[PDB]
Amino acid sequence: PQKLFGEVTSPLFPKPYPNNFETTTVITVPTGYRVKLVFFDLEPSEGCFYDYVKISKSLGRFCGQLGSPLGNPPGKKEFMSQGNKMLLTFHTDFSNEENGTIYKGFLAYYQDLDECASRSKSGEEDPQPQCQHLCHNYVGGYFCSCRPGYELQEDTHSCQECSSELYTEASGYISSLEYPRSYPPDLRCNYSIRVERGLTLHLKFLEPFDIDDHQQVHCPYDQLQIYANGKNIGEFCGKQRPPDLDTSSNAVDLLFFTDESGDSRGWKLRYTTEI
Amino acid sequence: PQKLFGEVTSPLFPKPYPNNFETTTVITVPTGYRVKLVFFDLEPSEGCFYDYVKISADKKSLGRFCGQLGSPLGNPPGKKEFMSQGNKMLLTFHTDFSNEENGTIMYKGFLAYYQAVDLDECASRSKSGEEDPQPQCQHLCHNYVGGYFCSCRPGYELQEDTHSCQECSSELYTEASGYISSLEYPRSYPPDLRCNYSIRVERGLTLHLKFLEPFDIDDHQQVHCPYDQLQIYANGKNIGEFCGKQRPPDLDTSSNAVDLLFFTDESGDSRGWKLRYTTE
Ligand SMILES: *[C@@H]1O[C@H](CO)[C@@H](O[C@@H]2O[C@H](CO)[C@@H](O[C@@H]3O[C@H](CO[C@H]4O[C@H](CO)[C@@H](O)[C@H](O)[C@@H]4O)[C@@H](O)[C@H](O[C@H]4O[C@H](CO)[C@@H](O[C@@H]5O[C@H](CO)[C@H](O)[C@H](O)[C@H]5O)[C@H](O)[C@@H]4O)[C@@H]3O)[C@H](O)[C@H]2NC(C)=O)[C@H](O)[C@H]1NC(C)=O
Ligand SMILES: *[C@@H]1O[C@H](CO)[C@@H](O[C@@H]2O[C@H](CO)[C@@H](O[C@@H]3O[C@H](CO[C@H]4O[C@H](CO)[C@@H](O)[C@H](O)[C@@H]4O)[C@@H](O)[C@H](O[C@H]4O[C@H](CO)[C@@H](O[C@@H]5O[C@H](CO)[C@H](O)[C@H](O)[C@H]5O)[C@H](O)[C@@H]4O)[C@@H]3O)[C@H](O)[C@H]2NC(C)=O)[C@H](O)[C@H]1NC(C)=O
Ligand SMILES: *[C@@H]1O[C@H](CO)[C@@H](O)[C@H](O)[C@H]1NC(C)=O
Ligand SMILES: [Ca+2]
Ligand SMILES: [Ca+2]
Ligand SMILES: [Ca+2]
Numbered sequence: 001p002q003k004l005f006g007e008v009t010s011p012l013f014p015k016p017y018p019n020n021f022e023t024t025t026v027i028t029v030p031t032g033y034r035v036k037l038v039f040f041d042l043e044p045s046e047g048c049f050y051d052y053v054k055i056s057k058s059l060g061r062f063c064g065q066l067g068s069p070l071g072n073p074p075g076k077k078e079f080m081s082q083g084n085k086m087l088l089t090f091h092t093d094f095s096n097e098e099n100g101t102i103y104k105g106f107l108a109y110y111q112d113l114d115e116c117a118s119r120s121k122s123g124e125e126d127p128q129p130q131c132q133h134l135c136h137n138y139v140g141g142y143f144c145s146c147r148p149g150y151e152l153q154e155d156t157h158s159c160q161e162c163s164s165e166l167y168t169e170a171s172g173y174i175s176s177l178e179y180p181r182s183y184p185p186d187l188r189c190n191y192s193i194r195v196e197r198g199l200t201l202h203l204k205f206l207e208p209f210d211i212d213d214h215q216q217v218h219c220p221y222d223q224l225q226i227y228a229n230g231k232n233i234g235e236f237c238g239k240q241r242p243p244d245l246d247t248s249s250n251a252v253d254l255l256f257f258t259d260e261s262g263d264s265r266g267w268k269l270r271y272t273t274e275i
Numbered sequence: 276p277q278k279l280f281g282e283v284t285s286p287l288f289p290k291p292y293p294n295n296f297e298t299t300t301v302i303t304v305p306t307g308y309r310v311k312l313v314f315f316d317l318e319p320s321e322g323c324f325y326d327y328v329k330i331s332a333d334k335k336s337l338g339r340f341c342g343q344l345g346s347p348l349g350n351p352p353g354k355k356e357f358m359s360q361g362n363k364m365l366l367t368f369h370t371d372f373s374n375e376e377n378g379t380i381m382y383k384g385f386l387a388y389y390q391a392v393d394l395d396e397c398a399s400r401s402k403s404g405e406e407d408p409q410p411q412c413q414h415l416c417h418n419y420v421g422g423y424f425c426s427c428r429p430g431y432e433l434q435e436d437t438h439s440c441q442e443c444s445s446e447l448y449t450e451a452s453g454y455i456s457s458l459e460y461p462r463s464y465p466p467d468l469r470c471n472y473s474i475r476v477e478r479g480l481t482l483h484l485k486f487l488e489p490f491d492i493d494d495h496q497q498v499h500c501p502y503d504q505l506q507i508y509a510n511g512k513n514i515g516e517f518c519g520k521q522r523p524p525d526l527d528t529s530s531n532a533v534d535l536l537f538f539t540d541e542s543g544d545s546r547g548w549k550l551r552y553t554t555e
């Protein structure tokens with residue numbers, strides 16, 4: 001159910017616990033949270049065979065009076081669960097007169113984290129919430145966010161096609177995915193711009209340019225084809241920047257033909273207007 | 276109202292921002308909480324005079340910055356977390372009349388996110404525990420969603436302020452053998468208290484008594500017990516005004532019911548007293 005916090009009396013508190021008893025109380029804090037727990041007048045015993053409060057994978061089993069040394073006394077230390085569920089167990093054997101010739105009990109209190117905080121043991125072995133770029137530590141679970149562009153559909157894990165990234169402004173910057181790091185392969189991209197009618201576009205490339213090339217046949221691996229006003233104007237590849245050009249039109253289409261194994265760095269560009 | 280999370284767009288996003296503009300968006304997450312905020316394509320400038328985004332917590336200046344992302348020496352913010360002291364967040368967006376720098380006329384804007392992570396004053400204590408308002412607990416406290424409350428001494432529950440953790444009205448005991456001590460042994464006793472601990476055993480028995488060490492009640496050596504008094508009423512009548520440093524001796528009650536009473540001074544130096552009782 002819905003449990004902010006609560007109090008667990010050992011049954012009959014503060015009147016002593018009845019001997020011969022084993023009752024379990026189970027916390028169910030809201031799912032996706034961690035529980036907190038603090039306070040113990042019971043019978044000490046080495047290893048707590050006589051009496052013990054078993055509490056949780058297993059946290060511990062202890063017994064004993066508060067200010068008593070060599071009685072395994074638990075105290076008031078915090079201990080957080082990994083998941084939404086907490087488990088208490090109370091066991092008192094038949095004798096509260098152990099070490100005989102004839103204990104009140106215990107009254108405690110109970111009350112979240114995010115796997116982006118420290119990636120407990122690994123990122124790809126537990127049920128994968130992790131993200132390559134980043135994630136956020138919030139109250140109410142955890143969601144993801146990546147390097148800007150598309151918003152990584154429903155799973156929010158992967159950080160994702162180039163259908164139409166739109167741009168209808170005069171001058172802008174366009175870079176390949178994740179520049180200057182190695183470019184992503186196996187992509188058929190289209191960057192299209194239709195500028196306000198009555199202009200041509202002045203173009204100026206930048207370095208280091210990087211597309212894996214072949215010096216015997218130009219651009220078998222990757223291709224960078226440029227379609228002007230509806231027609232083909234160049235298949236570029238290599239490492240050194242091609243020279244500046246003028247379009248003489250008000251609208252264009254750019255496309256990217258990449259390989260299936262990326263070693264190179266990429267390509268970055270700038271475009272301006274002139275009347 | 277009810278605000279889990281949300282995003283603050285520079286007006287007209289992703290289309291560029293209109294110059295001559297100053298719009299302020301204020302987060303009001305539920306009270307008793309903190310806001311968290313992370314992401315910026317704006318105009319860099321030394322000191323962010325041209326354009327700047329001015330942002331602050333409860334009642335304190337966080338910062339004012341600007342500049343493009345991969346730009347050094349532009350005071351660029353990034354996506355770093357910054358938590359408020361309080362429940363209310365304050366964003367301010369300022370654009371001067373000129374974004375047209377280098378003869379190279381223009382920035383998309385900014386699209387951010389804010390959350391409502393709780394705060395629990397039992398987690399830490401900024402500079403001290405006794406200097407911040409309503410010091411909720413001396414002993415311990417609890418870290419919960421919606422603030423923090425306290426509780427002490429499994430008897431009474433620390434009246435209205437829920438700060439102090441203090442009275443001995445009637446602490447009852449109807450068991451055979453038990454241990455009784457002054458409050459907070461072996462440490463020094465609280466003075467100025469009129470306490471009454473009484474026990475009535477099932478009829479047909481007497482009670483054997485055995486003190487424990489070291490006994491301590493502030494005394495005077497010429498006339499006994501001026502500051503503190505330890506008066507003991509058996510079967511309804513008085514049996515002793517005891518004080519000093521050495522333990523009194525064992526006794527036999529000869530009754531099925533008794534009454535204890537304690538007269539404290541208003542200044543404690545001693546430690547206290549501990550005892551054990553059995554049946555016959
Ligand atoms: C990269 O991305 C660009 C994006 O623009 C893209 O260019 C676009 O190509 C497509 C190709 O399908 C064009 O779509 C249609 O093209 C029709 C051409 O007709 C010839 O070819 C047909 C076969 O495809 C053939 O059947 C015909 O007989 C003829 O031979 C055209 O008829 C059609 O017209 C509609 O256009 C728009 C919708 O885009 C409608 O609305 C108008 O929109 C514009 C703004 O876009 C404006 O605001 C107007 O006011 C508004 O009315 C319109 O009413 C028609 O119904 C349609 O155009 C795209 O037009 C073309 N985009 C352009 C020209 O801007 C590249 O090809 C991509 N590169 C790739 C894929 O490699
Ligand atoms: C420390 O704590 C003890 C408490 O144990 C306390 O002793 C208590 O003193 C008071 C005195 O006010 C007793 O209360 C009543 O005493 C009546 C005596 O009557 C004489 O004195 C009156 C003035 O005090 C005077 O007006 C009369 O005319 C007369 O001269 C007595 O009659 C009365 O009887 C009622 O007792 C109980 C309520 O206590 C009633 O209910 C019963 O309760 C028990 C369990 O408690 C059980 O469940 C029964 O089934 C139930 O019926 C009953 O009906 C009578 O009406 C009442 O006793 C306390 O009794 C007395 N407690 C004792 C003796 O245990 C000390 O003074 C304290 N010391 C401090 C504070 O320093
Ligand atoms: C166990 O026996 C009695 C309990 O009646 C106790 O007094 C004694 O000290 C105990 N033995 C120990 C502590 O060795
Ligand atoms: Ca027992
Ligand atoms: Ca979370
Ligand atoms: Ca390559």
Ligand SMILES: [Ca+2]
Nearest residue numbers: 294370373374
């Ligand atoms: Ca501006």
Ligand SMILES: [Ca+2]
Nearest residue numbers: 394395396422
């Ligand atoms: Ca709190």
Ligand SMILES: [Ca+2]
Nearest residue numbers: 493502540542
């Ligand atoms: Ca004294």
Ligand code: NA
Nearest residue numbers: 176183265266
């Ligand atoms: Na690249």
Ligand code: NA
Nearest residue numbers: 457464546547
């Ligand atoms: Na004391």
